[PDB]
Design a protein around this ligand. Structure first.
Ligand code: CLA
Ligand code: CLA
Ligand code: CLA
Ligand code: CLA
Ligand code: CLA
Ligand code: CLA
Ligand code: CLA
Ligand code: CLA
Ligand SMILES: CC1=CCCC(C)(C)[C@H]1/C=C/C(C)=C/C=C/C(C)=C/C=C/C=C(C)/C=C/C=C(C)/C=C/C1=C(C)CCCC1(C)C
Ligand SMILES: CC1=C(C/C=C(\C)CCC[C@H](C)CCC[C@H](C)CCCC(C)C)C(=O)c2ccccc2C1=O
Ligand SMILES: CC1=C(C/C=C(\C)CCC[C@H](C)CCC[C@H](C)CCCC(C)C)C(=O)c2ccccc2C1=O
Ligand code: SF4
Lengths: 139, 73, 742, 42, 80, 151, 104, 69
């Protein structure tokens, strides 16, 4: 499951759009995927890179940069074998996406609903009733 | 400037300046405690309104006092 | 023979059916309106051909026929300028007395008291004074009568009909295939050799056989109706020899290479004609002939159908060094498959050429009696500076559309585009620093001077009297150009322009041209120019370079060229598109060109234009106040805007009352624009809800549901009315001022 | 006359331009024959 | 962080989940609607506040509602 | 041959290895500057940086200040340099107070004690360099003009 | 002279790429290849009967005689200096391109 | 004004020389087409003679300028 750090990266000539000091002191994100070919893609941070046949690995500063590349590869090259990780400066690696092996738009058992409100949006509480009270406006 | 130009432009400028500070020798020894960001949407509306209003007041005050003093009538 | 003509016959049927179906060209709009946004969406995207069609062939066909339609409009416009000169003008009176009669080719009808605009322009005529310089063009052409202006108007009408026919024919009857349009070598060969070279050559023939004899007779003092008709110069060589004796030898000196025989009419005089204050037409004839040879030679460079010539792709692919990766590889494919990339280049070039035209025409006045018609000189400078600034911003607009749409990284691996995008942070950070440094050290000098002058410390100012900022490099270049005749241009007789130094040229007791000296004020306003040009480049370059993705929005290319925002998140991403940098950069273009035309207007009135008097001294229009008053902002406010707005604001009840009204009308429109620029759509949609309620109450609600304009359209309406009001106010101020005093 | 060309002349911008040009034209004609009507003459 | 709510008017069209650029939303099982599924927001610490989910939603007033709240490095979209 | 490569072998860091950034000449200059030179205590780094900055600060104040045409121009220029020095030392001290946690390490610039040492050295060297510039300009008529004494 | 033609120094044009700047050969060859054609005389008031290199060198000596005083705005020194160094830099650029790149 | 000369056999000489020069030199340099009897056709002849009248006209005018004639 865990990120094999030794995976070769896509060939790239470098750019100024990559990650900065906050990546090595706050968090960095990684994306891995399998390619059937040695083909050109566009980096979220800049110009063009070439993905190597087999397994690829990138490091990006934002999670959204990892997911923007993931949508681009899925539509352009029909690759869905992408895994997104969060990596902390302690060395600890956090698997992120897809979170339980199944993509979020496909249903899965054992997913518990978070954020679900039992009434429609117009049935919320007016601000005055919950003033100087800790009670939430969602009913 | 605060009322016509909006946030997305300025945030992309500030990101090029953050890069330049981090890459410039003898200057990257000095670090911000707070990450430089563009002003918020509401804050920029307020900053432009304050500048507009202050310019309105100062211009008219100079005219109404100086024209009356200079003319005396 | 791979360069060949290939045509589809009868592609599109000439039918009125799609005229009756507005929105037929796109799948979204063709199903009809449901909200008022559809109406705006109909006009906004209509000439965006590559958003309706996928195929490059149909796009190319639509563009070719739309270019014929534009040519038809230009020919009709030219025909109307010639017809109004023939029928409603005092051109004949102007030819007899140029330095007294004021050109006028527009007469108003008497309806609501508006016939006050038919002022006394002179020559027994009443009309609106015109400042386009057509009279001087016609006199340089050798027109000399209204009848020939009627024939020119008819020639324009015939050409206009031929262009609108050709656009119809080449879209509906005979439309070329894509492989015809993708012939860049053939097109360049014909447009350099054929369009430019033959055009220059044919004009040189007209100047030698028609313009030069008629204008020599006019400047000798012969009356216009006493001058022989232009074809008697063509047939009787004896009269042409009497004017210029080299014509006695004919074309034998041309073919035997004994070209110094033709020095009567092919000169290199330089300077100005003393009689008219214009360029020597013998110089312009030699100039056009020299250009024609160079353009025709240039036209033989590229390879078309016989093995001689260059491959443009090979030239581009060979230029690559150690800093730049694969080099210019892949640029040929871009520039023959993307119309937007070509329009980006050609708009930047057309705008640059229009700014060069603006500079070169006041400094080396080409037409007879145009240098002392000061309303025309101010008008044609201001007009070509505005056309230049607009076209330059459209080059960055279509560079952004190229990057968002036509750019594909697979064909652009490690070439020059890929490398620019991969160090765009270094480019924009260094440009940003230059714009900050140059705003501090240009405009802060003005703020320093306002503060010192206000404090009573005139010795602490940046001025000629006090601390001096001297434009030593420009003064030195002026020295070189004044020393050039007989030295580094040995066969020149005079300087290229008297602006660099030399004599005062006076025509009709008015200065044509005289040296434009540079001091501390000139140093300061030139660095103001460098600052405003730099930041305008930064806004447009930042828009083109970050059009596809940023650190802010990693997938900006999927949203397109023109989107309003990507939501209030990430702190707020309002105005993040490439379109919004064109939107913001047209304001800075407006700022730049406004200071350029103000600098020109004040400097020419203060130090160049005026009346020569006894003892050879010259009294200028504003009496040389530029040097000591263009160094503070208060000087520009008082001695330029306030002092020279006297003529526009006192114009009521005269023939210039139209400028007085347009001054106020444009002040109004400008202010009205800030309603659209400072406001947001959500307020106006909620206000429209209550107005819709009042219509619902009376059962008169429309079936096309009213909407507030989109976020992008709100920005576009604000920018359009801002540009109209600001430029219109300057137009009214400039024209009333210079018609009254110049 | 062709019904599709008449349907084009029935489109909103054409009718708007024709109707207000006609409107403008009879205001212009009324102020030509009867100018400076500051008041209803009575 | 931003607070994202899903109200029971959700028809289970999955459009918000496909539109979300930061993987905040996912589909869970629910018998309330015909589609048998409702959106859920388990990962709101990653919400940047783009409101692309709200744009995608087809119910009359949005079943998904984003309430912009406290800002973080994640919700500011800062790569520095 | 290519002169632009990924920074420190890493293609995904936000920098490039360009001749200005990483040539031998650049690395020699950067490695030998007092901020980065090896074997220097932070106080000595402060002294060398201060001597340099204090020395050039005197000149613009003296030549272009309000009292430049007076005979107290050099006095006013030195004292103006001193005022700027005191304000900048206040800026350095407050940066140190808010940017570094208190730890025993004192031989690096980016530590609390190392920053306090650098600030101490920078103030001493800066006043020293300004004083040296004052002495040189006071005594040598070439420096009082722009070299204009020779003409 | 940050690196000569011989493989002696370790000067790397960038992080990891060693590149021999041929500062002696390029400077010498570009100087001679620019100065020798420029010896062509011309009876123009700027040149005064000399070539551009020789009139330039003459104007260096003339202004060095009046050592503290700078040459004036109308003095031929500035125009000679500009054109000379313009063509010299162009010939160094083209020479460095030709020698480093084509290597023969 | 630079001094040009009426046509003489020396002018003819310069024209002929430049013309032959451009034939031979063009024959080698041209990249798309028995030293002159392989692949020599009318467009190559017409191009080399067009460059011949260009080089020849420049040579005639320059040699007339300097006094060589
Ligand atoms: C192309 C540029 C151009 C411009 C800007 C002008 C401008 C002018 N001309 Mg000139 N003119 C031109 C070309 C031009 N002309 C040409 C090419 C000719 C030669 C044929 C003339 C011949 C000419 C004459 C003979 C006269 C003018 C006059 C005038 C003035 C008043 C025109 C007017 O109010 O009539 C308005 C006339 C109307 C019939 C009103 C028509 C309004 C309609 C409704 C416009 C609608 C367009 C339509 C809806 C488009 C869509 C088509 C449809 C199928 C939907 C005005 C200054 C007059 C003048 O100077 O008097 C002193 C005058 O008498 N012009
Ligand atoms: C000698 C050949 C020749 C000439 C003169 C032109 C001229 C022109 N082309 Mg080009 N073109 C050529 C060959 C030529 N083309 C070839 C071979 C191709 C195929 C590769 C193209 C493909 C091409 C495209 C795809 C487009 C053009 C366009 C244009 C117009 C540019 C806009 C402009 O400045 O017009 C204004 C200037 C003028 C001088 C107007 C002149 C109008 C006529 C047509 C000029 C020639 C008349 C005739 C030869 C003169 C007879 C003289 C006689 C009285 C003695 C201009 C008319 C553009 C355009 O606007 O299309 C309409 C455009 O989009 N051309
Ligand atoms: C496209 C441009 C153009 C056109 C249509 C013409 C057309 C003409 N020129 Mg002009 N001409 C032009 C460009 C042009 N020229 C240029 C660029 C130059 C400068 C080199 C001249 C210089 C020139 C001279 C010096 C003469 C003509 C003459 C003529 C006429 C030719 C008569 C002839 O063969 O006997 C020519 C005479 C021989 C002895 C042979 C004819 C009207 C001749 C003429 O009739 O004068 C009115 C004449 O003498 N032309
Ligand atoms: C040769 C010139 C040229 C050409 C062919 C094009 C062509 C195009 N441009 Mg480009 N552009 C140009 C110049 C040009 N532009 C210049 C000079 C600028 C700088 C301002 C731009 C800025 C620009 C932007 C920012 C955009 C385009 C877009 C487009 C496309 C859509 C056009 C459309 O449907 O508009 C329809 C036309 C209109 C709606 C006309 C209304 C425009 C103004 C408000 C009316 C004019 C006012 C009038 C002159 C004065 C009124 C008088 C007053 C007193 C009453 C098309 C590919 C758009 C696009 O998305 O393409 C992909 C787009 O967003 N262009
Ligand atoms: C008078 C109005 C005004 C002013 C001063 C500015 C100022 C600026 N704009 Mg803005 N702008 C304006 C109107 C204005 N804009 C409008 C109306 C728009 C609408 C479209 C924009 C849109 C816009 C964009 C899109 C861009 C700018 C940019 C810039 C900067 C240019 C760089 C520069 O000159 O730095 C130097 C600063 C100045 C010249 C400001 C005046 C400072 C003087 C010297 C006095 C300083 C006093 C001093 C600090 C006092 C200290 C003590 C005090 C604190 C007590 C600068 C911050 C660009 C930018 O940021 O790039 C760098 C940029 O991209 N502006
Ligand atoms: C809502 C404001 C308003 C009002 C009430 C009027 C009312 C009037 N105007 Mg004024 N006007 C207005 C706006 C207004 N105008 C605007 C915005 C403009 C600028 C375009 C003008 C420009 C204008 C002019 C230039 C003239 C008028 C004239 C007139 C009169 C025309 C009577 C008529 O048609 O008889 C016509 C005859 C009939 C039988 C009907 C009337 C008193 C005219 C007048 O008579 O002045 C006294 C006149 O010459 N107006
Ligand atoms: C100004 C002097 C000059 C010029 C014009 C050239 C030109 C050329 N050299 Mg040479 N070279 C020079 C100085 C110069 N070199 C010196 C000083 C050295 C020694 C250090 C060399 C050593 C050298 C070698 C070892 C080789 C060349 C080669 C070449 C050719 C192609 C490669 C190149 O440099 O592209 C330059 C490309 C062009 C000049 C043509 C492009 C046309 C544009 C308009 C360029 C103009 C640039 C500039 C404005 C011209 C300035 C001229 C003058 C006023 C200074 C080209 C003919 C190579 C070759 O092909 O072998 C023969 C090769 O192997 N050169
Ligand atoms: C070997 C024969 C020969 C000779 C002696 C000359 C000599 C000359 N030519 Mg010619 N030339 C020649 C061949 C020759 N050229 C060829 C083969 C061509 C190609 C077609 C040219 C094309 C050419 C052009 C296009 C021009 C000259 C010019 C000149 C003269 C001025 C150069 C100068 O100092 O400007 C110095 C200018 C600078 C900018 C230097 C810095 C000079 C006397 C020019 C001139 O003034 O002619 C009267 C001119 O316009 N020549
Ligand atoms: C030239 C050049 C050419 C090529 C390009 C280039 C590199 C950009 C450019 C360089 C330009 C630049 C940037 C040149 C920069 C040059 C600079 C800034 C030189 C600074 C010198 C400082 C001195 C001499 C301080 C001396 C202090 C002393 C002796 C101490 C005295 C005191 C102490 C404490 C001890 C007690 C007594 C007192 C008197 C109190
Ligand atoms: C210029 C500009 C910026 C950039 C402006 C910034 C980053 C402000 C930075 C100014 C300096 C750093 C501090 C300002 C200091 C003031 C003189 C006042 C200081 C505080 C006093 C009240 C005490 C935006 O971020 C922005 C965002 C949204 C819409 C429009 C705009 C906009 O127009
Ligand atoms: C007034 C205003 C509106 C409302 C404006 C509307 C609904 C325009 C409707 C005006 C009428 C319906 C048409 C205007 C016609 C005029 C007579 C001029 C026509 C000009 C050409 C288009 C014909 C917005 O929608 C808006 C949106 C975003 C920022 C600012 C604003 C804003 O300021
Ligand atoms: S304000 Fe208007 S533009 Fe800025 S984000 Fe909210 S919606 Fe998009």
């Amino acid at each position: 499951e865990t990120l094999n750090l030794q995976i070769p990266s896509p060939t790239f000539e470098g750019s100024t759009g990559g990650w900065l000091r906050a990546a090595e002191v706050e968090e960095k994100y990684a994306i891995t995927w399998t390619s059937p070919k040695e083909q050109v893609f566009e980096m979220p941070t800049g110009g063009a890179a070439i993905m190597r046949q087999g397994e690829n690995l990138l490091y990006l500063a934002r999670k959204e940069q990892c997911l923007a590349l993931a949508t681009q590869v899925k539509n352009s090259f029909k690759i869905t074998d992408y895994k997104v990780y969060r990596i902390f400066p302690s060395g600890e690696v956090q698997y992120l996406h897809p979170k339980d092996g199944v993509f979020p738009e496909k249903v899965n058992a054992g997913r518990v609903g978070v954020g679900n409100v039992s009434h429609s949006i117009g049935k919320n509480l007016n601000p005055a009733q919950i003033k100087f009270t800790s009670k939430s406006f969602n009913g | 400037m605060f009322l016509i130009s909006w946030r997305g432009y300025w945030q992309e400028l500030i990101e090029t300046l953050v890069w330049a500070h981090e890459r410039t020798p003898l200057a990257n020894l000095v670090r911000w405690k707070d990450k430089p960001v563009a002003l918020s949407i509401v804050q920029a509306r307020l900053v432009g309104l304050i500048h507009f209003t202050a310019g309105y007041i100062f211009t008219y005050a100079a005219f109404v006092i100086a024209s009356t003093t200079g003319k005396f009538g | 023979k791979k360069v060949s003509i290939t045509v589809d016959r009868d592609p599109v049927a000439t039918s009125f059916e799609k005229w009756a179906q507005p929105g037929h060209f796109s799948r979204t709009l063709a199903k009809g309106p449901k909200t008022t946004t559809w109406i705006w969406n109909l006009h906004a995207d209509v000439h965006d051909f590559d958003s309706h069609t996928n195929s490059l062939e149909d796009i190319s066909r639509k563009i070719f026929s739309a270019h014929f339609g534009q040519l038809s409009i230009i020919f009709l416009w030219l025909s109307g300028m010639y017809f109004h000169g023939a029928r409603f003008s005092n051109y004949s009176a102007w030819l007899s007395n140029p330095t007294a009669v004021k050109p006028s080719a527009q007469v108003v009808w008497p309806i609501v008291g508006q016939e006050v605009l038919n002022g006394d322009v002179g020559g027994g005529f009443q009309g609106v004074q015109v400042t386009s310089g057509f009279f001087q063009i016609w006199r340089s052409s050798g027109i000399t009568s209204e009848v020939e202006l009627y024939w020119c108007a008819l020639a324009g009408l015939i050409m206009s009909g031929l262009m609108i026919f050709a656009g119809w024919f080449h879209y509906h009857k005979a439309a070329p295939k894509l492989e015809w349009f993708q012939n860049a070598e053939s097109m360049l060969n014909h447009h350099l050799s054929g369009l430019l070279g033959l055009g220059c050559l044919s004009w040189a023939g007209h100047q030698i056989h028609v313009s030069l004899p008629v204008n020599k007779l006019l400047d000798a003092g012969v009356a216009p109706q006493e001058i022989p008709l232009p074809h008697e110069f063509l047939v009787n060589r004896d009269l042409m020899a009497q004017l210029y004796p080299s014509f006695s030898k004919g074309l034998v000196p041309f073919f035997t290479l004994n070209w110094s025989e033709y020095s009567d009419f092919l000169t290199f005089k330089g300077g100005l004609n003393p009689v008219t204050g214009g360029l020597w037409l013998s110089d312009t004839a030699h100039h056009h002939l020299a250009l024609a040879v160079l353009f025709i030679v240039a036209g033989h460079m590229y390879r078309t159908n016989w093995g001689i010539g260059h491959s443009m792709k090979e030239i581009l692919e060979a230029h690559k060094g150690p800093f730049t990766g694969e080099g210019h590889k892949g640029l040929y494919e871009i520039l023959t498959t993307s119309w937007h990339a070509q329009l980006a280049i050609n708009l930047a070039m057309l705008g640059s050429v229009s700014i060069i035209v603006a500079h070169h025409m006041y400094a080396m006045p080409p037409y007879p009696y145009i240098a002392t018609d000061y309303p025309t000189q101010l008008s044609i400078f201001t007009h070509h500076m505005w056309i230049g600034g607009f076209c330059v911003c459209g080059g960055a607009a279509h560079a952004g559309i190229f990057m968002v749409r036509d750019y594909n990284p697979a064909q652009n691996y490690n070439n020059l585009l890929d490398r620019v995008i991969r160090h765009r942070d270094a480019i924009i950070s260094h440009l940003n620093w230059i714009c900050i440094f140059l705003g501090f050290h240009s405009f802060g000098l003005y703020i320093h001077n306002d503060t010192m002058r206000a404090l009573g410390r005139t010795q602490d100012m940046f001025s000629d009297t006090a601390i001096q900022l001297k434009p030593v490099f420009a003064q030195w270049v002026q020295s070189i150009h004044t020393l050039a005749p007989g030295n580094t241009t040995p066969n020149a007789l005079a300087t290229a322009s008297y602006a660099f130094g030399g004599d005062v040229v006076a025509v009709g007791n008015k200065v044509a041209m005289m040296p434009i000296s540079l001091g501390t004020a000139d140093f300061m306003v030139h660095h103001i120019h460098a600052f405003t040009i730099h930041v305008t480049v930064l806004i447009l370059l930042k828009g083109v370079l970050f059009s596809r993705n940023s650190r802010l929005i990693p997938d900006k290319a999927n949203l397109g060229f023109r989107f309003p925002c990507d939501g209030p998140g990430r702190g707020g991403t309002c105005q993040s598109s490439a379109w919004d940098s064109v939107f913001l950069g047209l304001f800075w273009m407006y700022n730049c060109i406004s200071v350029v035309i103000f600098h020109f207007s004040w400097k020419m009135q203060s130090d160049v234009w005026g009346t020569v008097q006894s003892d050879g001294t010259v009294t200028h229009i504003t009496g040389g106040n530029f040097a000591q008053s263009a160094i503070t902002i208060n000087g520009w406010l008082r001695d330029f805007l306030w002092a020279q707005a006297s003529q526009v604001i006192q114009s009521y009840g005269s023939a210039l009352s139209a400028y007085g009204l347009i001054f106020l009308g444009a002040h109004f429109i400008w202010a009205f624009s800030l309603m659209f620029l400072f406001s947001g759509r959500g307020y106006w949609q909620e206000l429209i809800e209550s107005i819709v309620w009042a219509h619902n109450k009376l059962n008169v609600a429309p079936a096309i549901q009213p909407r507030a304009l989109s976020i992008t359209q709100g920005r576009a309406v604000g920018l359009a009315h801002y540009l109209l009001g600001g430029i219109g106010t300057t137009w009214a101020f400039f024209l009333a001022r210079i018609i009254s005093v110049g | 006359m062709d019904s599709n060309f008449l349907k084009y002349l029935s489109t909103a911008p054409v009718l708007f331009t024709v109707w207000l040009s006609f409107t403008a034209s009879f205001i212009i004609e009324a102020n030509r024959f009867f100018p400076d009507m500051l008041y209803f003459p009575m | 962080s931003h607070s994202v709510k899903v109200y029971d008017t959700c028809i289970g069209c999955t459009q918000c989940v496909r539109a979300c650029p930061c993987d905040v939303l996912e589909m869970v099982s629910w018998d309330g609607c015909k589609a048998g599924q409702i959106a859920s927001a388990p990962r709101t610490e990653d919400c940047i506040g783009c409101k692309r989910c709200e744009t995608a939603c087809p119910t009359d007033f949005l079943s998904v509602r984003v309430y912009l709240g406290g800002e973080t490095t994640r919700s500011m979209g800062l790569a520095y | 041959s290519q002169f632009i490569k990924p920074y420190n072998d890493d293609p995904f860091v936000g920098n490039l290895a360009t001749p200005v950034s990483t040539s031998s000449f650049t690395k020699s200059l950067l490695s030998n500057l007092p901020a980065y030179r090896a074997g220097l205590s932070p106080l000595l780094r402060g002294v060398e940086i201060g001597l340099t900055h204090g020395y050039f600060l005197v000149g613009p104040f003296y030549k272009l200040g309000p009292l430049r045409n007076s005979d107290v121009a050099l006095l006013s220029g030195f004292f103006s340099a001193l005022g700027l020095i005191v304000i900048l030392v206040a800026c350095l001290t407050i940066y140190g107070v808010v940017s570094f946690e208190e730890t025993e390490a004192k031989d690096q610039l980016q530590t609390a004690k190392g920053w306090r040492q650098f600030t101490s050295g920078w103030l001493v060297g800066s006043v020293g360099g300004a004083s040296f510039a004052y002495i040189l300009i006071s005594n040598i008529p070439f420096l009082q003009t722009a070299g204009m004494s020779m003409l | 002279l940050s690196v000569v033609a011989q493989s002696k120094s370790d000067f790397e044009i960038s992080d990891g790429t060693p590149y021999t700047l041929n500062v002696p050969l390029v400077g010498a060859a570009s100087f001679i290849g620019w100065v020798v054609p420029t010896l062509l005389p011309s009876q123009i008031a700027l040149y005064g009967g000399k070539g551009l290199s020789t009139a330039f060198f003459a104007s260096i000596g003339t202004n060095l005689a009046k050592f503290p005083a700078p040459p004036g705005m109308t003095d031929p020194f500035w125009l000679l200096c500009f054109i000379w160094h313009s063509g010299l830099f162009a010939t160094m650029i083209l020479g460095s391109i030709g020698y480093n790149g084509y290597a023969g | 004004v630079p001094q040009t000369v009426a046509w003489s056999a020396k002018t003819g000489a310069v024209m002929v020389l430049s013309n032959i020069l451009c034939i031979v030199a063009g024959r080698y340099v041209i990249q798309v087409k028995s030293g002159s009897f392989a692949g020599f056709g009318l467009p190559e002849l017409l191009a080399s003679t067009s460059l011949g009248h260009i080089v020849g006209s420049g040579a005639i005018l320059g040699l007339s300028y300097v006094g060589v004639l």
